[PDB]
Design a protein around this ligand. Sequence first.
Ligand SMILES: [Ca+2]
Ligand SMILES: [Ca+2]
Ligand SMILES: [Ca+2]
Ligand SMILES: [Ca+2]
Ligand SMILES: [Ca+2]
Ligand SMILES: [Ca+2]
Ligand SMILES: [Ca+2]
Ligand SMILES: [Ca+2]
Ligand SMILES: [Ca+2]
Ligand SMILES: [Ca+2]
Ligand SMILES: [Ca+2]
Ligand SMILES: [Ca+2]
Ligand SMILES: [Ca+2]
Ligand SMILES: [Ca+2]
Ligand SMILES: [Ca+2]
Ligand SMILES: [Ca+2]
Ligand SMILES: [Ca+2]
Ligand SMILES: [Ca+2]
Lengths: 206, 206, 206, 206, 206, 206, 206, 206, 206
Amino acid sequence: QTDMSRKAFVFPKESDTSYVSLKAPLTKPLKAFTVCLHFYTELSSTRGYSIFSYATKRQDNEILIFWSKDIGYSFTVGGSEILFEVPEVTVAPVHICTSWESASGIVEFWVDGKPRVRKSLKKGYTVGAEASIILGQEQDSFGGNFEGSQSLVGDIGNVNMWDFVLSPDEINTIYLGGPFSPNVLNWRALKYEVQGEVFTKPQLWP
Amino acid sequence: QTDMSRKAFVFPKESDTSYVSLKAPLTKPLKAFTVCLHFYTELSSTRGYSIFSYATKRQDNEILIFWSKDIGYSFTVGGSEILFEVPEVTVAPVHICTSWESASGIVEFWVDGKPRVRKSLKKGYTVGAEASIILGQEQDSFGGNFEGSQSLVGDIGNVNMWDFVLSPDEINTIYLGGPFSPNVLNWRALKYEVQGEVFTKPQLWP
Amino acid sequence: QTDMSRKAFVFPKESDTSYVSLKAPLTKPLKAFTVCLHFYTELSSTRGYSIFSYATKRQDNEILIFWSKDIGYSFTVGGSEILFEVPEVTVAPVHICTSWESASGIVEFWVDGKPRVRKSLKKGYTVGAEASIILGQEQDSFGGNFEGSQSLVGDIGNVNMWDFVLSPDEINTIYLGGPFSPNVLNWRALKYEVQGEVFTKPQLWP
Amino acid sequence: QTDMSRKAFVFPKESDTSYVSLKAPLTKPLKAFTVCLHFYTELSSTRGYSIFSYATKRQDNEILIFWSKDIGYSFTVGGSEILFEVPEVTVAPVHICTSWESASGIVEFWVDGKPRVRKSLKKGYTVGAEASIILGQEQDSFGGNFEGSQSLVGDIGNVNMWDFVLSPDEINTIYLGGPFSPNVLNWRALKYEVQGEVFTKPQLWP
Amino acid sequence: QTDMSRKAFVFPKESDTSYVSLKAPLTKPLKAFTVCLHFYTELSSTRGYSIFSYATKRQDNEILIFWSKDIGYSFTVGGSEILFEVPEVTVAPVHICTSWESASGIVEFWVDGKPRVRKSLKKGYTVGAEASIILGQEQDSFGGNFEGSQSLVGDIGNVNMWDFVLSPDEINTIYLGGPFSPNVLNWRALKYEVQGEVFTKPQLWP
Amino acid sequence: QTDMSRKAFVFPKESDTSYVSLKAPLTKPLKAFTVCLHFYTELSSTRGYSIFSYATKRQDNEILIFWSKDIGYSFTVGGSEILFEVPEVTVAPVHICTSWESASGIVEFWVDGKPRVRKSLKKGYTVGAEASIILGQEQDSFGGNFEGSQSLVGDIGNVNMWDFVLSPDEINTIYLGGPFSPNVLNWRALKYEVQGEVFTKPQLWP
Amino acid sequence: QTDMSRKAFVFPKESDTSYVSLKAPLTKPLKAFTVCLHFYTELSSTRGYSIFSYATKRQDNEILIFWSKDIGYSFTVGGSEILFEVPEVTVAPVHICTSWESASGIVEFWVDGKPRVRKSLKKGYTVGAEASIILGQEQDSFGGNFEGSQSLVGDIGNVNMWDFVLSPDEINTIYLGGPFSPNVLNWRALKYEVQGEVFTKPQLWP
Amino acid sequence: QTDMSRKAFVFPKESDTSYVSLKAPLTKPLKAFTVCLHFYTELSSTRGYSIFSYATKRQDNEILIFWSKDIGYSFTVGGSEILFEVPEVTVAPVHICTSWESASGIVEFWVDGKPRVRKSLKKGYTVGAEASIILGQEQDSFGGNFEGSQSLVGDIGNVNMWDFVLSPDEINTIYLGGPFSPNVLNWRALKYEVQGEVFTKPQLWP
Amino acid sequence: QTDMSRKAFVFPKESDTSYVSLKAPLTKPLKAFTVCLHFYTELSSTRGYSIFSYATKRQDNEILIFWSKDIGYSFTVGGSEILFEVPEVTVAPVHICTSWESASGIVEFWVDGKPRVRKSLKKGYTVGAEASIILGQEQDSFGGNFEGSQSLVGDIGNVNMWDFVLSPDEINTIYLGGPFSPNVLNWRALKYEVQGEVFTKPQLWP
Ligand SMILES: [Ca+2]
Ligand SMILES: [Ca+2]
Ligand SMILES: [Ca+2]
Ligand SMILES: [Ca+2]
Ligand SMILES: [Ca+2]
Ligand SMILES: [Ca+2]
Ligand SMILES: [Ca+2]
Ligand SMILES: [Ca+2]
Ligand SMILES: [Ca+2]
Ligand SMILES: [Ca+2]
Ligand SMILES: [Ca+2]
Ligand SMILES: [Ca+2]
Ligand SMILES: [Ca+2]
Ligand SMILES: [Ca+2]
Ligand SMILES: [Ca+2]
Ligand SMILES: [Ca+2]
Ligand SMILES: [Ca+2]
Ligand SMILES: [Ca+2]
C-alpha cells in the first residue's frame, strides 16, 4: 500500500493504452458506497470521458462516473444511468463525491462541496464485490476493451471510497480537507497497478 | 411526535403517490398565519410543483404555495392567487417564509432572508381549521386527487407554522437560525404520516 | 380578551404592592387541573418566592406553586404540601407545568419538558371555583396580605390553565410550542387586572 | 407628534383612493431643501409612479419625485423637470436623498448612498410654504386629482425633510443610520392623515 | 466617518492615556438607549475595568458599563448602579447588549445572546445629550481623569448604540449578525479620535 | 391480555399493600431468562427498593432486581446476590435489561443501553416455573410479607421477560423499543392483578 | 482456524486457572510488532491485571500489557517497563493498540483511537518468536505460575497482532473497524486453546 | 528541500544533544513574523521545555516559545518575555500560532484555533536574519549550550514561518488545514539537519 | 549581474529593432526547465507577440512562449507546438510560469497562480544549452531576423529560469514572491544587453 498523498496520475495524451487499476480489499458485496475524487481535464467541451470505472464480471458498468458531452455527469449503477446535468462548465479542477444506497436507491452527487438534488437509482440492487476499478479508461469487459474516445486526458487523484453513505457534514470535511478514513479505497493506502503512459506528479490543485 | 431537526423528507421520484401528511390539532380557524420551510428541487426550470398544500373540505387550495414554471412562486389563499415573479431561478436550496393577515389581507414573502413587496390577498377571509396539510403533492380533494405532474421532486424541511404574522425581526432570526417556537406546526415536534416513496435523510442545507 | 402572546409581566423591584390578578371564567369546582407557566427570576439562590398563587375564601393556599430556598419547588393544594427537590439551579428562564387530579391525588410536576416522579396529594379533595388568582405575590387572604419577602422579582408569562390533566404529549407540545387551547386560564385571551409597579414587555424567552 | 420609527406605510393595491397626507409645520418659503425616504415597489418595470409629491395651490408639481418607466427618476421643482437615468433597476428596497438649492439651482440626487452628478434646476426659484404633501399618489390639484396609473404600490417610509442641503457626510449618516434631526418633516415626530386602504406595518428594510 | 467593519481597537498595555473618543452629534436627550459591543480581555480575573464610559459635564458616570472583579458586570445610569453577577467567567470574547428605558427604568442585559433578568434603574431619569464617549478608560471628569487601574486591556469593537430599547428579536438578529441600523453610534459610520497607544486590527471574534 | 403500551403502573405513596402481580404463561423451568423494564423513582438516594420481585414457593428471592442504597443494583438468583455498583446516580427514568444463563451462570446487566461487565452467578441452577411475580413490593413469602421500607414508590413499565438470553443486538432493539416478541411476560399482552393504591397512567418516559 | 468475529472470551470469575492460550504461526524473531485488542473489566479501580502476556522460554515478560492500579497501562518489552499514566478511569470497554520497533525503540500506545506520546523502550532488542501468548493471566513461566491477583476478570477480544508497526492511518482503520490483515495473530483466523472457566459469548462492545 | 508533510520529529528521550536545526533562506531582517507548529509532549505537567528556539549571534533568545511549568506558554522576543497563562493543561496534541509585529509590538498567540488576547512586546524592535533555528533544545549560544532540563521530549511538526502577521482568517485556514504558502520556513519544503538521537515518524495528530 | 528588482524593460513602440538579450551562464544541456515572467501589453486584442524566445543554432524556436491571436498562449519546444486556449482576456499584467521535462514531455503552464492542465510535448527531446534568449522580439535566426508584427509592445520583467520543473508549491511561492533562487536565469542577478528603443522603469505591477 502506497501513500499517494499530494500526487496525481497524469494521463497527458489521448490513448486507449494508458490506465491505472486500483485494487480493493472488498470482502463484502456493497449495499451502499461513497466515492470521492479530484480530476482536472479540458476535455469537457470537446468530448465525454470516463471519470471512474467500476466493473464486475456480470456488468462492465457496475459503478461508472462519466462526463457526457453537452449534458454533464452521467452516474450509473448496475447499468441504470442518472444525469446530473451541468449547463456551464469551466476549466478548473473539480472535486466530486457520489453516494448510493440500496435500501432507498438515493443517489447523492456533490460537486465542489455543493450537493445536487437527491435522485433515485437501482433501489434494492447490490453491487458485486469482485470488481475491476480503472482510472483513465472506460472498460467494457471486466478488465479491458477500452475506447480511446472515452479515455481521460489530464489529472485524477484523491480517489477515496467508503462502503457507506457519508453524511453531508462528513463530505464537507472531505471537501475542506478535514481528517477521514476511507474503508474500501484509500488514497493514503492505495494498492494500484500502472499500465501504459501514466505519470505520477505533484497535484496541481490545492 | 418526532424531532425532525436536521432531517428532511426526500421525494426522489416523480409520482402521484409519495406524500407526507402533517397533523395540526388546530382548534381556532386562522385569521393569520406564517409558514416557513426549506426546499430543494431542480424542477424549477422543467415544470411547476406544489411546495406546501393546505386544504379544507370546502376548498382544496385553502393555502397553497406553488412554483409556476417560468413565472415563480404562486401563493393562493381561499383559492385566490397572487404571483411573485422570479425571472432568474438558480439551483440551490431556497428558504421561504410567507405570511398572510386577514385584517389587512397583506401577504409577506421572504426568500433566502430577503422580503418581497407586500401584496394584498383575501382581506377579511378566514382559513378553515379542519385542514389537510400535504407535502410533496398538490391536492384537489380534502386528502387526495394528486397530480404527478405537480409533485415535488427533491427535498422539503424545516416546515414551521404560526397562527400570526411574524415581524421581520423574527423572520431574520428564523433565517439566521435563532431560536423560535412555532405554535401551529413544529419541525421539532412534528406529527406526520408517510405514504409512497418518501425517505428521512440528513438535510443537505446548513 | 387581550392576547398576551410574546408578552410577559415584569416585576422589576421587590415590593408587596406589585401584582396582577387573573380572572378565571370558572364556576364548576375543579376535580382536576393543569397549570403551566414560564418564569424567570434571579431570586432562586437568594430567597423563596411565589410563582403561582390561587386562593379561595376558605383557603389562601388552595393552589400554590412556590420556590423554597435551597430546597426547590413547593407544590401545595388545599393547604397540604409536597416538595420536588432541585439540588442545582441555573440562571436561565424555566418553564413548568403541574397537574393535579382529585380521583388519584397524583401530582405531576414538569420542568423544561422533563417530568418529575409522580407524587400523591389530597386525593378526593376539590379546588374551589371562586378564586383569587394572583401573580407576583403570595396571598394569605382572598386578594391580600402579601409579603414582600415572598414576591416574585422578574418575569412571568405564558400562564395557561386547564381543568383537566394534560397528557405527556400535550405537555411536550406546550413546552415546544405547538397548538393548544386552555379552558380555565388562557394567555391568548387573558382577563387580568394590574396593580402597582408592573410592566408588560416582550418576553425574553423564545 | 407621532413616532413612526421602524414603521412603513403600505399601499398594497393600485388605486387613486389610497394616500397619506403629511403636515409640515413650515412657515418660511423654502430656499433649499433635502428630502430622504425609503420606498419599495415592484412597479418600476411596469409603469411610473409618484414617490413624493409636494404640491401648492399655484403649482401641483412644486416638488415631485417620480419614477418614469424605463427612464428612471424624474426630479422636478416648480414644474421644471430633470432626469437621473437608471439603466439597470433591481427589485430591492431603495433609499433616496434629494437636495435642491435655489442659490445655485444645484440638484443632488442620491441612491443607496451613491451620488448622481449634480445638475442645475430652477436657480433663483422659491418653493411655496403653503403646501400639500402626499405619499402614494400624484396630485394635480392642491389635494386631489389623483390617478391610479401614478399611484405607488408597495412601501414608503423614513420620510425626512430639511430646509437645507445636507452635506455628503450627513447624507451618509442618513443612509447608514446615525443621528439626525429634520426640521421640515420628521418621521419620528410625524403629523399625517390616512385616507383609503393604507396600512402601517413594520418596515421590511433595516 | 470610517467603516470599522471587521476591525477592533486594540489596547495592548495598561495605561492611563490610551483611549478612543467616540463622537455623536446627538441633539435630543436620551429617554432610552441600547448599547451593544464585543470586547475581549484577560483582566476579568485580575481586576475591574471600564467597558463603556459615557460622561456629561454634570455626571461622569451617566452611562457606564463596568466589570467588577469577582462580582460581574456593573451597569449604571446617572450614577445609580446595578449588578449582573457572573460567577463563572471564561477567557473568550464576549458580546453584550444593554438597554435602559426611562419610562419604566427597566434595564435589560444580554450576554452572548442570553438575556439576564430585567431589573429597575433610574426610572424617570433622562440621559444628557452633550456627552463624552470613551473606550478603554473610565472617566471621572468630562473627557479626562482616567485611572490606569480601571483601563481596558485587550480588544473592543462592533460598538453600536440606539436611542431606543431593541426588542429581543432585534437583539437576536444583532448577535447572529443580521442586518441592523444603529441610530446613535454606528460602527460602520464611526467618527472617533484616538489618543495614545491604540491600534486598529482585524477582529479576533467572528 | 391487556395492551399496556404507553402505560405505566404508578405507585405514588409508600405502602406495604400497593402491588401488582403479573401472571406468566410459563411451563418449563427457566434455564435462562432476560427481564427488561423501565422504572422511575426518587428513592435511589434515600433507601433501597424492589424493582422486580420473582418468588417461587421454595425461594422468595428466586429472581430479585433490587436497588440497595449507596451501592446500586443488587441482582440475585436462587437467593445468591451479585452487585452492579453505581457510584453516581441521577434522577431520570432508567431502562434496564438483565440476563442469566444456567449453562454458564453468566449474568448480563444493562443500564440505559450500556452493558455492565458480565459476572458469574448460579451456574447449573434452575429457576422454578411456579412463580409469583410482583411489582412494587419485595415478597418474603410466596406472595406476601411485604415491607414499606422496600416498596417501589414511583413508576414501572415496559416489563418484558424472555426465557432465553437476548443477544446485545436484540437488547439494543429493546432499548430503542423496536419490534420484539417476549414469551414469558409481555407488556403488550399482559395478564395482571392490581391490589391497593396503584394507578395506570401514560408513561412519563418517551 | 476459528473466525472469532463478534465473539469475546469471557472470564467471569477471579481464578488462577482460567486462561486461553493463543498459537502464533510465526518463526521469524520480531524486530517490530503491533498488538491491538478490546477488553472490558471493572478491576481497574480495585487492582492491576494482565491484559496481554507474551512469554518466551527465556523471558516471561517478553511482551506484557499490564494495568497498574492507580497508575495506568504498564507496557514492557524484554522485561523493561514503561508507563502510560491514566489519572481517571471510566468503566467502559476500551480499545488499545501498542507498537514497538527495535530500530528506534519507539513505543506507540493508543487508547480508543487517541495516541499517547511516543516513548523509548528496548532499542536494538529482538523478541523471540518461540512464544506462549496467554489471555486472562500473567505467566511467570513459559505456560504457568499464574497469579489470581493478576488475572483478567471480564472480557477480551478482537486480539490482532502484526510483526510491523502499523501507521496511524492503519490504526485509525483498526479502531473504526475497517479492513486489515494481521500476520502474526488474527482474530478472524484464531488458533487457540481454552483452560478452566472461560466462555465464548457475543461481544458487548460495537 | 525535503517534503516533511505528515511527518514529525520524535525526541523520545531526554538529552542535551538531540535537536533538529532548521535553516531559513532569510536575508532581510524581520520586522514581523508568524510561527505555527504542532507539538505533543507529556512534560507539560512535569517541567518546562523549549518549543521553538531562534537565536542570533547577539541574542540567544531572539525568538523563544517556551512552556514554563505551572505558568504556561512563555513567548519572548529580543530577550523580553510575555506570559500567556494556561491554568489547566491536558495531554493532547496542541497546535499553536504566534505573531509579532514591530510597528505595534502586538503579539498574537493562538492555541487550537482560539486567540489569546493581544499583548505588547518589543515595539520598534527588529529580528536578525543571521539566525540559528533549533527544535528540541533551548539554546544559550548561537548553535549550542543546550540543557537537558529544557529539552523537548516528544513530537514536533508542521513548523511553518512567515515574515508577516497572518490575519485571523489565514490562521483559521492554517488550523483547519486549508492551503497556505509560508515564506520563511516551510514544512513542505524544509531545509534541516538532524543531530543526535532523533527520529522522523508519521505524525500522530491528523 | 544586475539586481533588476522592482524594474522592468519597457518596449513602448512597435519595432523590429528593440530587444534585450539575456545571457545564461549555462553549460549543461537542458533536460528540463521552468521559466516565469510578468508581462503587460494591449496587443492581446490586436495581434500575436513573442513573450519569450529561446533559440539555439539548430533551432530558432527551441523554446518560445507566444501569444497567438484569438487562440491564447502558444508554447513550443524544439519547434513542436501546443496551445493553451484562452477564450476570455483581461487587459492587466499577467504572471505566467511554464515548465517542461524531457523524461515525460509533460508541460505545465500556469497563469496568475492557476494551473492549466498538464500536456505532453517533445518526450525524450533535449534542449540545447548554447542559445540566444531575446525579450521583445521573435527571432528567426540565431540572433536576428526579427518581425515587428511579432514584437512585444509594453512591459516584460521578473524573467527567472530554472533547469528543473518547479513543484506547484515552488511556483506558488514565485507568484506570491516568496524567496527563490533561479539557477539558469535570475532576475536578481541578470546578465543582459539592450538594443534599440528599450527603457528600464519601475514595474507597474505589484
Ligand atoms: Ca465504453
Ligand atoms: Ca462500459
Ligand atoms: Ca388543488
Ligand atoms: Ca392539482
Ligand atoms: Ca399562604
Ligand atoms: Ca404568606
Ligand atoms: Ca397626475
Ligand atoms: Ca401633478
Ligand atoms: Ca467615573
Ligand atoms: Ca474612575
Ligand atoms: Ca424484604
Ligand atoms: Ca424475600
Ligand atoms: Ca512475569
Ligand atoms: Ca507474576
Ligand atoms: Ca536562552
Ligand atoms: Ca537555557
Ligand atoms: Ca523563429
Ligand atoms: Ca517569425
